[PDB]
Design a protein around this ligand. Structure first.
Ligand code: HEM
Ligand code: HEM
Lengths: 431, 431
C-alpha cells in the first residue's frame, strides 16, 4: 500500500518496500517530524512499515481530528489482557473505561491527594539534603525517579514506602520490574503482533487488588469493573506517573539551572506565596502563576509523548481532504511546539510565552503537551500537581547549578522515549 | 480466554489450551454442530483455537442477531487486497459495497440474464447427450462444473466459451486456477494471519477489467468503485457461482435419482409448463412450484454454507443473555435444518415440506440456506434461477438413475466444504 499517498496526491518521503520510512528514524522520531514539517509543509504521509501515517499540522484539521470527529471517525489509537487498558481500549469500551475513571481524576479527588504526595516531597528533600551536604552534584533521575515511584504507588495503592532508602520492600522491587528493538521491529513488522509484561507481575498486583478488594483502586471501584480491568488501569497509571514525572522533572530542573534568573524568580514566587518554607497546599499551588509558566514552558520544549495519534475508522473528508479508513492520523506535537510559524525563537526557553498577557495568543491545538479532545490525557491535573508540589518543596530548600558533568547543551535520547541523552546531573546547594 | 464461557455460565465442550475445540472437527464441522445441539441444547460455546464462538439456535435470538441488531452489534463476519470483497468488507465499507451491488442482483437484472444462461443449459444437454449415448453413467461434477464455470464467466464477463469442449481457452484455464490445512491451522493459529491467490490471476482479471473499463462489471460500474474493488467482487462471484452451483446440482440430482417418484413428478411439471421441450424463461421458471419445492428441500438437507457467523462488535445483551464483544455468534444452519424439534423425519427427502400448504409452518430463521437479514446471500435469486434453468433443460431431456458406482447412502465430505464424499455418478437415459 506504499502507493497510497501518491495516489492521494499527498507528499512525503519515499517509502521503501516493507520498511516504509522507518530508516528515517535514525535521527529520532522527533527530528524526522521536524525535517518533515520543514520540507513537505502542512500535511505529509509516511509509512511505518506498511502502515500509512498521515501527519497534520493545521489547527482546524487538528481540532477536527481530536475534538469534532472524535467519536465518529478518530476514536482510537493504533493497537500495535492489557486490551482493557484505557489508553488501548476502543470505542464503546474505551468510553466505558473513561466514564468510570473520569471522577477518579476530578480536581476534587486531587485536592484530597495533596497531603499524601506532599509528604513524599518532604522525603525528596531529605534525600536531596543527604547529597547536597556531601557538597557535590546529583543524578536527578535517581532522586526524581525515587520520588515519582514513591508517589505513584501510594496514590494507586496506599503503601507508604521510601524507594531510595528501602532497597527491596517487596512492593518496591516488583514495581521496579518494568523494563525500542520491539517498537521498530513492530513498526515495520506489526504482523507478528498476533504471536506474542511478566506474568509474575500481573499476579502480585491482581493478588494485591485483594487487599483492596476487601487509593485509585477504591475510587475506581467507586458492565462490572473486572478486577483485571482494574489491573490494566493501574499499570497504565504506574507507567504514566513514573517515567513521565521523573523525565519532566529532570527537564525542568535542567532549564532552571541553565536559567538561574528563572529559577531564583521562581524561588521568589514560592517564598511569597509560601513564606518560610510553608507546606504547599492545593489552593496555594494554583496561585503560583510563574510556576505554571515554568511548567508549561518546559512541556512546550519537551512534550514527552512527542506525537498524538488517531486511527481513521471510516473513509471521511475533513476540512477538504480525504482520509481513507485505517490511516493513522498523527499530530507531531514536538515539531509543532518548535515551529517558527507559531513560536518566537522556538529553541529558546522563555516562560513568558504563557504569561497572562501572551497566553491568549497560543492556539490550544498547536500546543498539545497533554493532547486535546475527549481522549486527551486523563491524568493531566494530577501530573501537573505532582510535579508542581515537588518543585515547590525542592526550590523552597535548594538552588540548582550546572557542573562539569552537566551536559550542556542537553542532547535528547535517540530512541523512542523522550529523555535526556545523558542523565541530568546538577550541583545542589542548600539555600 | 478459555475460561470465558464457564465464566458466563454457558455450557460447551471443554476447550483444550491453544487448540480450543478443533479436535472435535474430525467428525466434520456439521456433525460437531449436531452433536453439540443434542447435548448442550439451545446455546453453547466453543473455542476455535483461542477464538470463542457462541452457537445460538433460538429463532428469536437468531432474528436478533441477523436482522434486528445487525447494523449495531453484529455487522461483520470474522476476518480470519481482498479486504475489499463484499463478504469480508466491514461496517460502512460493506454497506457501501452492498448498496452498489444491490441493483446488480435485482429480480430485474436477472430476467435479462435468462437468455444468456439458458444457452449454457443447451450446452449441458449436448455434453450430457454425448455421455448418455455412450450408454453409461456420468460424473455429475464434471458436466455440472463445466456448466457452472461456463455460466459464471459469461455472466460476470460476457465471454462465450465451452469449458468441457474448449480445453484451454486462455480465460478458461485461468478461471480453473482457483485451488482445509490452512483453515484448521488458521482456526487454531489465526495469529499468523498477519504474515501471509496467485498474483498472476488477479492481474489477468485486473487487466481483463480493461476490456470492460472501455456483464456484472458494467452493472457494477453502473467514493469511487476502485477497479481492484471491482476485481474483489468478481472473484467472490466466481467462487460463489462455481463451487456452490455445481455442488447443489449434484445434491439435487442425487435426490432426484434416489427418488424417481419426485423426479418423474418434476418432469411432469416441466412438461406441462414447458410443453415439448419448450425453452425455459424467467416467468416460466417462477411458475414451477414443485421445482421450487425440490430445490428448497435439497437446500434444507444440504445448506452448502453450513454455518452463518456474526462478530459481536460491542458488549450487548440480546433476548436476555450477555454477549461480550469479539465473540463470534454462529447459527448452525446444517444442524438446525436437521432438527427433529422443527422438522418431521429430518433425514428424509420430502419436498412436500415446502408445499403452499406447509410452507407457512416453517420458521424463516430456522431455515436459512441463504441466511437472512441485510447481510444474507446477495446472489440468492441468481443462484436459484441458475440452478432451476439447468434442471429444467436437463429433465426436459433426460431421466437419471443410480448405478453400481452410485454411493448410496450419499456420504458427506469430512473436510470444510459441503460436497459429496464420493462424486455423484448416475446413469443417464434419454427420455
Ligand atoms: C507530565 C506528565 C504527562 C504528560 C506530558 C502526559 C501526556 C499525555 C498525552 C500527550 C496523552 C495523549 C492524549 C491524546 O492523544 O490526545 C496522554 C494520554 C493519557 N494519559 Fe498522560 N501524561 C502525563 C502523565 C500522566 C499521568 C500521571 C497519568 C495517570 C496516572 C496519565 C494518564 C493518561 C491516560 C489514561 C491517557 C489515555 C487517555 C485515553 O486514552 O482516553 N498521564 N497523556
Ligand atoms: C445455491 C448457491 C448458494 C448458496 C446456498 C448461498 C448461500 C449463502 C449464505 C448462507 C450466505 C451468508 C449469509 C449470512 O451470513 O446471513 C451467503 C452470502 C453471500 N452470497 Fe451466496 N450462496 C449461493 C450462491 C451465490 C452466488 C451465485 C452468489 C453471487 C454470484 C452469491 C453471493 C453471496 C454474497 C456476495 C454473499 C455475502 C453478502 C454480504 O456479505 O453482504 N452466493 N450466501
Amino acid at each position: 500500500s506504499h502507493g497510497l499517498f501518491k495516489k492521494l496526491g499527498i507528499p512525503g518521503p519515499t517509502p521503501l518496500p516493507f520498511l516504509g520510512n522507518i530508516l528515517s528514524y535514525h535521527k529520532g522520531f522527533c527530528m524526522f517530524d521536524m525535517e518533515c514539517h520543514k520540507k513537505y509543509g502542512k500535511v505529509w504521509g509516511f509509512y511505518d512499515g506498511q502502515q500509512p501515517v498521515l501527519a497534520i499540522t493545521d489547527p482546524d484539521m487538528i481540532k477536527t481530528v481530536l475534538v469534532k470527529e472524535c467519536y465518529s471517525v478518530f476514536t482510537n489509537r493504533r493497537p500495535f489482557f492489557m486490551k482493557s487498558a484505557i489508553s488501548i481500549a476502543e470505542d464503546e469500551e474505551w468510553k466505558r473505561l473513561r466514564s468510570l475513571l473520569s471522577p477518579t481524576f476530578t480536581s476534587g479527588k486531587l485536592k484530597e491527594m495533596v497531603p499524601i504526595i506532599a509528604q513524599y516531597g518532604d522525603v525528596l528533600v531529605r534525600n536531596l539534603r543527604r547529597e547536597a551536604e556531601t557538597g557535590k552534584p546529583v543524578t536527578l533521575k535517581d532522586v526524581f525517579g525515587a520520588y515519582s515511584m514513591d508517589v505513584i504507588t501510594s496514590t494507586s495503592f496506599g503503601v507508604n514506602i521510601d524507594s531510595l532508602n528501602n532497597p527491596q520492600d517487596p512492593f518496591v522491587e516488583n514495581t521496579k520490574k518494568l523494563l525500542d528493538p520491539f517498537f521498530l521491529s513492530i513498526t515495520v513488522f506489526p504482523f507478528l503482533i498476533p504471536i506474542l509484561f511478566p506474568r509474575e507481575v500481573t499476579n502480585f498486583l491482581r493478588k494485591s487488588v485483594k487487599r483492596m478488594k476487601e487509593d485509585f483502586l477504591q475510587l475506581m471501584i467507586d458492565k462490572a469493573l473486572s478486577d483485571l480491568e482494574l489491573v490494566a488501569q493501574s499499570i497504565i497509571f504506574i507507567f504514566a506517573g513514573y517515567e513521565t514525572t521523573s523525565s519532566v522533572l529532570s527537564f525542568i530542573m535542567y532549564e532552571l539551572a541553565t536559567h538561574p534568573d528563572v529559577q531564583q524568580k521562581l524561588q521568589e514566587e514560592i517564598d511569597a506565596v509560601l513564606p518560610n518554607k510553608a507546606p504547599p497546599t492545593y489552593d496555594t499551588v494554583l496561585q503560583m502563576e510563574y510556576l505554571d509558566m515554568v511548567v508549561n514552558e518546559t512541556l512546550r520544549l519537551f512534550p514527552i509523548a512527542m506525537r498524538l495519534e488517531r486511527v481513521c475508522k471510516k473513509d471521511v473528508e475533513i476540512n477538504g481532504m480525504f482520509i481513507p479508513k485505517g490511516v493513522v492520523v498523527m499530530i507531531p506535537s514536538y515539531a509543532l511546539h518548535r515551529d517558527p510559524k507559531y513560536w518566537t525563537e522556538p529553541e529558546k526557553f522563555l516562560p513568558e510565552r504563557f504569561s497572562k498577557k501572551n497566553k491568549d495568543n497560543i492556539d490550544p491545538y498547536i500546543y498539545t503537551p497533554f493532547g486535546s479532545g475527549p481522549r486527551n490525557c486523563i491524568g493531566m491535573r494530577f501530573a501537573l500537581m505532582n510535579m508542581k508540589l515537588a518543585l515547590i518543596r525542592v526550590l523552597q530548600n535548594f538552588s540548582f547549578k550546572p557542573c562539569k558533568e552537566t551536559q550542556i547543551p542537553l542532547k535528547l535520547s535517540l530512541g523512542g522515549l523522550l529523555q535526556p541523552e545523558k542523565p541530568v546531573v546538577l550541583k545542589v546547594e542548600s539555600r
